[PDB]
Amino acid sequence: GLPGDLFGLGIASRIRTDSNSTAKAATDFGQMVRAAPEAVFHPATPADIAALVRFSATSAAPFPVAPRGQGHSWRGQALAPGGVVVDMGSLGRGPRINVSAAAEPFVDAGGEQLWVDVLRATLRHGLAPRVWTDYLRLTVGGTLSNAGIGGQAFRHGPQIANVHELDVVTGTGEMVTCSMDVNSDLFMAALGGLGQFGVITRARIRLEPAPKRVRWVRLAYTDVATFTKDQEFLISNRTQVGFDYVEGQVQLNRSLVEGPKSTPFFSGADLARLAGLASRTGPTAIYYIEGAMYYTEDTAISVDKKMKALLDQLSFEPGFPFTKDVTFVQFLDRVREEERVLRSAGAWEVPHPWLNLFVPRSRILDFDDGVFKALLKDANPAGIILMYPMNKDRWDDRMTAMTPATDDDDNVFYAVSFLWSALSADDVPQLERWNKAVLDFCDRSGIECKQYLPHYTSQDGWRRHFGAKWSRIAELKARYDPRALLSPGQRIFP
Numbered sequence: 001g002l003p004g005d006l007f008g009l010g011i012a013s014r015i016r017t018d019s020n021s022t023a024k025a026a027t028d029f030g031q032m033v034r035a036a037p038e039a040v041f042h043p044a045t046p047a048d049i050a051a052l053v054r055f056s057a058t059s060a061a062p063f064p065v066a067p068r069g070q071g072h073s074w075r076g077q078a079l080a081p082g083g084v085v086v087d088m089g090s091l092g093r094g095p096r097i098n099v100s101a102a103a104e105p106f107v108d109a110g111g112e113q114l115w116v117d118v119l120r121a122t123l124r125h126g127l128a129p130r131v132w133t134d135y136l137r138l139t140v141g142g143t144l145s146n147a148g149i150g151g152q153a154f155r156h157g158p159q160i161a162n163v164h165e166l167d168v169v170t171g172t173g174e175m176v177t178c179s180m181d182v183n184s185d186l187f188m189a190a191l192g193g194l195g196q197f198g199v200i201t202r203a204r205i206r207l208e209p210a211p212k213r214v215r216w217v218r219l220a221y222t223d224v225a226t227f228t229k230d231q232e233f234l235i236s237n238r239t240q241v242g243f244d245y246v247e248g249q250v251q252l253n254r255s256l257v258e259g260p261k262s263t264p265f266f267s268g269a270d271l272a273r274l275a276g277l278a279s280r281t282g283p284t285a286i287y288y289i290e291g292a293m294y295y296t297e298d299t300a301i302s303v304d305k306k307m308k309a310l311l312d313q314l315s316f317e318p319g320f321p322f323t324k325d326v327t328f329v330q331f332l333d334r335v336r337e338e339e340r341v342l343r344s345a346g347a348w349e350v351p352h353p354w355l356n357l358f359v360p361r362s363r364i365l366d367f368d369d370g371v372f373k374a375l376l377k378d379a380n381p382a383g384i385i386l387m388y389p390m391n392k393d394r395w396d397d398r399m400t401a402m403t404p405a406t407d408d409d410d411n412v413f414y415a416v417s418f419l420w421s422a423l424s425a426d427d428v429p430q431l432e433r434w435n436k437a438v439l440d441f442c443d444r445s446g447i448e449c450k451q452y453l454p455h456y457t458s459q460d461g462w463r464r465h466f467g468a469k470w471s472r473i474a475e476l477k478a479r480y481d482p483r484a485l486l487s488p489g490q491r492i493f494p
């Protein structure tokens with residue numbers, strides 16, 4: 001498929017066209033889409049990626065180029081059929097993480113670097129990035145191409161709001177350093193850019209002093225209105241003396257009754273006590289607020305009084321607070337333990353038809369009514385459902401990443417993640433029907449359900465997703481990837 005002229009050049013020494021190489025680059029975490037590339041590119045340096053992109057961009061037959069991080073995509077976004085998959089991990093040679101601890105401390109990290117490896121390096125200097133995804137085995141460039149949301153995003157914004165600068169290889173093959181003050185149009189496009197404007201090869205990440213330990217809590221609710229009121233109180237300016245991390249989970253009645261006998265967080269005794277709570281008024285769903293209070297040797301003496309003062313302000317079910325006290329690393333890397341349990345049960349390397357939505361606060365109770373109370377009330381899917389609010393004023397609307405736009409008056413929106421697993425491959429159509437039912441319900445009810453980690457097969461879906469930002473995106477695309485070579489699996493510019 002690829003031009004014959006490629007194989008006579010220097011870049012071809014880092015090309016692998018064998019079946020074993022291309023098959024590894026053919027699938028992703030979702031395990032639903034298979035499309036092998038013509039070749040895998042193993043760059044030594046980011047300059048090699050630039051030479052590959054320039055060659056394609058100036059070629060008589062331009063081929064697609066897709067950077068692949070950890071392949072933690074589920075809709076074939078990192079796939080390049082008819083083209084080349086760039087193994088980003090190949091750049092991991094020599095020092096690829098540089099901390100400047102000396103004004104404000106920062107960490108320079110290769111786009112291929114795992115957040116887990118960034119954390120290890122910054123902790124040696126007692127520093128850490130401020131915002132984390134729940135899963136640390138994801139690349140820096142991979143999460144920054146989306147936004148990177150987690151429990152600290154309500155305070156500091158997404159990971160894209162915690163970046164000082166980027167090194168980007170554009171779709172023309174040009175290596176550009178960009179920030180808020182230099183090449184700012186490229187900087188803004190790339191953050192939440194879905195790899196459409198260039199490959200992130202470096203990110204300068206914002207740092208803060210690292211905590212020592214975490215007081216980690218889970219608070220159970222049966223009433224969604226009380227649960228949402230408390231989450232909104234917890235992310236508000238009122239609560240300087242609150243949690244550093246705020247998340248939430250939705251547990252359907254059957255997933256607790258017919259689910260595992262214990263989990264890494266909950267003991268068998270905890271789950272039986274929760275089974276009683278969930279059956280109290282017939283079968284009902286449990287909503288959990290998950291909070292975390294960071295502390296060091298200096299704040300260790302006031303943390304117990306701080307936790308008591310905060311919890312006394314909340315309205316979780318009496319007798320249903322759950323507490324852990326762990327190191328900062330144990331907390332940030334908590335999902336490693338969950339993956340370990342899933343892997344031993346053969347429940348990890350299975351299909352993941354995942355759906356992530358951004359729902360305006362004004363419609364969160366209507367969303368809950370049609371989705372958890374009507375659609376999923378008697379459903380028993382494997383996996384987890386996340387639900388937590390965020391603050392719009394911590395997001396930069398000049399960046400590509402989309403937040404809901406219907407309520408300009410309202411600073412709050414909710415992230416709702418349907419992280420289901422098909423324990424049997426033939427369960428995929430059932431989870432895909434649930435995905436479609438939630439989206440159809442949003443359209444039918446007039447709920448502005450903006451996708452996070454979006455996927456659309458046609459440009460009409462993407463135009464609806466980008467809304468008032470679409471013309472700016474199309475213009476930026478013509479400027480930075482005119483031949484539409486980059487990350488074609490996104491299916492925005494076919």
Ligand SMILES: *Cc1cc2c(cc1C)nc1c(=O)[nH]c(=O)nc-1n2C[C@H](O)[C@H](O)[C@H](O)COP(=O)(O)OP(=O)(O)OC[C@H]1O[C@@H](n2cnc3c(N)ncnc32)[C@H](O)[C@@H]1O
Nearest residue numbers: 069070071072073077133134135139141142148149195200
């Ligand atoms: C698998 C998974 C994902 C995940 C998560 C937990 C798990 C188990 N938890 C998340 C969380 O708490 N918060 C959040 O914001 N996202 C979370 N995710 C999703 C994940 O961040 C994204 O899927 C993201 O893409 C990271 O994935 P990864 O590093 O594995 O990248 P990929 O799958 O190979 O590629 C994704 C797309 O981005 C393009 N790409 C990849 N690297 C780059 C660079 N350096 N520059 C530009 N574009 C890049 C790919 O081509 C593809 O289109």
Ligand SMILES: NC(=O)c1ccccc1NC(=O)Nc1cc(Cl)cc(Cl)c1
Nearest residue numbers: 134135149335338339356415417419453
């Ligand atoms: N408890 C967890 O959050 C979890 C447990 C097992 C495997 C993954 C986990 N977390 C996870 O996938 N979080 C996530 C995943 C995505 Cl795609 C998007 C967002 Cl907002 C959050």
